Design a protein around this motif. Structure first.
Motif, PDB file in Angstrom:
ATOM      1  N   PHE A  42       2.224   2.943   3.213  1.00 44.71           N
ATOM      2  CA  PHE A  42       1.869   2.123   4.353  1.00 44.71           C
ATOM      3  C   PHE A  42       2.811   0.810   4.425  1.00 44.71           C
ATOM      4  O   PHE A  42       2.605   0.105   5.265  1.00 44.71           O
ATOM      5  CB  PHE A  42       0.706   1.751   4.562  1.00 44.71           C
ATOM      6  CG  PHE A  42      -0.458   3.165   4.706  1.00 44.71           C
ATOM      7  CD1 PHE A  42      -0.835   3.500   3.511  1.00 44.71           C
ATOM      8  CD2 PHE A  42      -0.406   3.764   6.100  1.00 44.71           C
ATOM      9  CE1 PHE A  42      -1.653   4.731   3.644  1.00 44.71           C
ATOM     10  CE2 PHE A  42      -1.115   5.023   6.078  1.00 44.71           C
ATOM     11  CZ  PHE A  42      -2.151   5.452   5.046  1.00 44.71           C
TER      12      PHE A  42
ATOM     13  N   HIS B 127     -15.744  -7.373   7.001  1.00 42.01           N
ATOM     14  CA  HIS B 127     -16.192  -6.156   6.658  1.00 42.01           C
ATOM     15  C   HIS B 127     -15.944  -5.550   5.248  1.00 42.01           C
ATOM     16  O   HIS B 127     -15.035  -6.394   4.748  1.00 42.01           O
ATOM     17  CB  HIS B 127     -15.812  -5.046   7.760  1.00 42.01           C
ATOM     18  CG  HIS B 127     -14.421  -4.972   7.739  1.00 42.01           C
ATOM     19  ND1 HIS B 127     -13.405  -5.424   8.543  1.00 42.01           N
ATOM     20  CD2 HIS B 127     -13.697  -3.753   7.063  1.00 42.01           C
ATOM     21  CE1 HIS B 127     -12.177  -5.104   8.472  1.00 42.01           C
ATOM     22  NE2 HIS B 127     -12.254  -3.942   7.583  1.00 42.01           N
TER      23      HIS B 127
ATOM     24  N   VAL C 139       1.397  -4.377   3.749  1.00 36.80           N
ATOM     25  CA  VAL C 139       0.725  -4.691   4.625  1.00 36.80           C
ATOM     26  C   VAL C 139      -0.093  -5.931   4.957  1.00 36.80           C
ATOM     27  O   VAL C 139      -0.713  -6.675   3.895  1.00 36.80           O
ATOM     28  CB  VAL C 139      -0.705  -3.905   4.959  1.00 36.80           C
ATOM     29  CG1 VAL C 139      -1.550  -4.030   6.189  1.00 36.80           C
ATOM     30  CG2 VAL C 139      -0.097  -2.336   4.948  1.00 36.80           C
TER      31      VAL C 139
ATOM     32  N   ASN D  91      -6.096   1.799  11.075  1.00 35.96           N
ATOM     33  CA  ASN D  91      -6.955   2.737  10.042  1.00 35.96           C
ATOM     34  C   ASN D  91      -8.193   2.897  10.723  1.00 35.96           C
ATOM     35  O   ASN D  91      -9.188   2.168  10.648  1.00 35.96           O
ATOM     36  CB  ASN D  91      -7.202   2.060   8.830  1.00 35.96           C
ATOM     37  CG  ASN D  91      -8.108   2.883   7.966  1.00 35.96           C
ATOM     38  OD1 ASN D  91      -8.184   4.111   7.891  1.00 35.96           O
ATOM     39  ND2 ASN D  91      -8.921   2.183   6.963  1.00 35.96           N
TER      40      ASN D  91
ATOM     41  N   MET E  53       0.951  -1.282  -0.146  1.00 42.38           N
ATOM     42  CA  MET E  53       0.125   0.011  -0.002  1.00 42.38           C
ATOM     43  C   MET E  53       0.843   1.174  -0.010  1.00 42.38           C
ATOM     44  O   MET E  53       1.737   1.564   0.993  1.00 42.38           O
ATOM     45  CB  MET E  53      -0.814  -0.026   1.171  1.00 42.38           C
ATOM     46  CG  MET E  53      -2.010   0.986   1.322  1.00 42.38           C
ATOM     47  SD  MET E  53      -3.072   0.468   2.461  1.00 42.38           S
ATOM     48  CE  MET E  53      -3.736  -1.099   2.214  1.00 42.38           C
TER      49      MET E  53
ATOM     50  N   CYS F 196     -10.409  -6.803  12.007  1.00 41.98           N
ATOM     51  CA  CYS F 196      -9.715  -5.616  12.037  1.00 41.98           C
ATOM     52  C   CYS F 196     -10.127  -4.846  13.402  1.00 41.98           C
ATOM     53  O   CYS F 196      -9.587  -3.619  13.774  1.00 41.98           O
ATOM     54  CB  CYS F 196      -9.906  -4.538  11.113  1.00 41.98           C
ATOM     55  SG  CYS F 196      -9.029  -5.218   9.327  1.00 41.98           S
TER      56      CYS F 196
HETATM   57  C1  LIG Z   1      -9.134   0.676   3.898  1.00 39.90           C
HETATM   58  O1  LIG Z   1      -7.966   0.048   4.043  1.00 39.90           O
HETATM   59  C2  LIG Z   1      -6.896   0.951   4.481  1.00 39.90           C
HETATM   60  C3  LIG Z   1      -6.959   2.310   4.365  1.00 39.90           C
HETATM   61  C4  LIG Z   1      -5.946   3.075   4.836  1.00 39.90           C
HETATM   62  C5  LIG Z   1      -6.162   4.692   4.383  1.00 39.90           C
HETATM   63  C6  LIG Z   1      -5.140   2.630   5.494  1.00 39.90           C
HETATM   64  C7  LIG Z   1      -4.588   1.263   5.610  1.00 39.90           C
HETATM   65  O2  LIG Z   1      -3.880   0.589   6.227  1.00 39.90           O
HETATM   66  C8  LIG Z   1      -3.617  -0.579   6.480  1.00 39.90           C
HETATM   67  O3  LIG Z   1      -2.741  -0.935   6.976  1.00 39.90           O
HETATM   68  C9  LIG Z   1      -4.580  -1.369   6.406  1.00 39.90           C
HETATM   69  C10 LIG Z   1      -5.740  -1.032   5.597  1.00 39.90           C
HETATM   70  C11 LIG Z   1      -6.937  -1.826   5.367  1.00 39.90           C
HETATM   71  P1  LIG Z   1      -7.783  -2.021   6.958  1.00 39.90           P
HETATM   72  O4  LIG Z   1      -8.646  -0.860   7.223  1.00 39.90           O
HETATM   73  O5  LIG Z   1      -7.140  -2.653   7.833  1.00 39.90           O
HETATM   74  O6  LIG Z   1      -9.269  -2.941   6.871  1.00 39.90           O
HETATM   75  C12 LIG Z   1      -5.891   0.221   5.281  1.00 39.90           C
END
Ligand SMILES: COc1cc(C)cc2oc(=O)cc(CP(=O)(O)O)c12
Ligand SMILES: [Zn+2]
Length: 229
Positions: free
Chosen positions: A29, A79, A32, A179, A26, A167
């Protein structure tokens, strides 16, 4: 121990339970990790959560074929974010019946996800309405309240000491709640504690982004969420 299988990692947690792990680079980030579960129930297999992508999810099915060699009867996803539902099309291409919280299915298109085929609904106390989760075997599905997201659901595995927080739950040494972009910050702590109360005998807590931990993952997550209020 951990089994590297292509770009994924699999770890046996119990005689009939394995954790699947997949990675998405990502931007901003790092790469992940996201975890889900694979459960053998007699002559069939049940999956909790996809991998991040269709290709990775097809690889989960390939690992199941090689290591278990029984049909995957259903998958439940916890989710409407990519780490949990990004591989829905791969499950559908494989002929696997798919389930998600009704709210997850409603949110899926706007989140860029494909909806599951079937919708779970929940009683006021959080337990799944059983008619909506037919043939779930040992999987006990619980909606703990809004937390990491408003639609987040959790899964206990009957006959084991394992419960899956997805999560919602972070490990006992985690520095943050991750997040919070779609989170309900006011209700998070109560939802984390409700998960623990729903599965009081679960001593192994499995979660999306850390290795399985003790119940201190629940207390620590809730204590961190106390601050958000
Ligand atoms: C929708 O997803 C994310 C969005 C953002 C901005 C950062 C994120 O950073 C993570 O490390 C993991 C996710 C997926 P998650 O919210 O864990 O379902 C993630
Ligand atoms: Zn998420």
């Amino acid at each position: 121990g951990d089994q590297r299988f292509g770009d994924l990692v699999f770890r046996q947690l119990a005689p009939n339970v394995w954790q699947h792990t997949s990675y998405l680079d990502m931007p901003g980030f790092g790469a992940v990790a996201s975890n889900g579960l694979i459960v053998r129930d007699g002559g069939r297999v049940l999956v909790v959560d996809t991998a991040w992508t269709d290709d990775q999810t097809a690889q989960i099915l390939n690992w199941i074929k090689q290591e278990i060699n029984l049909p995957v009867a259903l998958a439940v996803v916890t989710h409407a974010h990519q780490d949990k539902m990004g591989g829905m099309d791969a499950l559908h291409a494989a002929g696997i019946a798919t389930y998600a919280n009704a709210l997850s299915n409603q949110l899926a298109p706007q989140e860029g996800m494909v909806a599951a085929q079937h919708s779970l609904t929940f009683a006021a106390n959080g337990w799944v309405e059983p008619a909506t989760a037919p043939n779930f075997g040992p999987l006990k599905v619980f909606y703990p309240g809004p937390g990491h997201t408003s639609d987040n659901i959790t899964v206990g595995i009957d006959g084991t000491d394992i419960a899956f927080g997805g999560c919602l739950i972070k490990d006992s040494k985690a520095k943050s709640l991750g997040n919070l972009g779609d989170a309900d910050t006011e209700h998070y702590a109560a939802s984390a504690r409700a998960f623990g109360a729903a599965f009081p005998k679960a001593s192994m807590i499995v979660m999306s982004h850390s290795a399985p931990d003790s119940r201190a993952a629940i207390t620590h997550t809730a204590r961190m969420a106390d601050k958000l209020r």
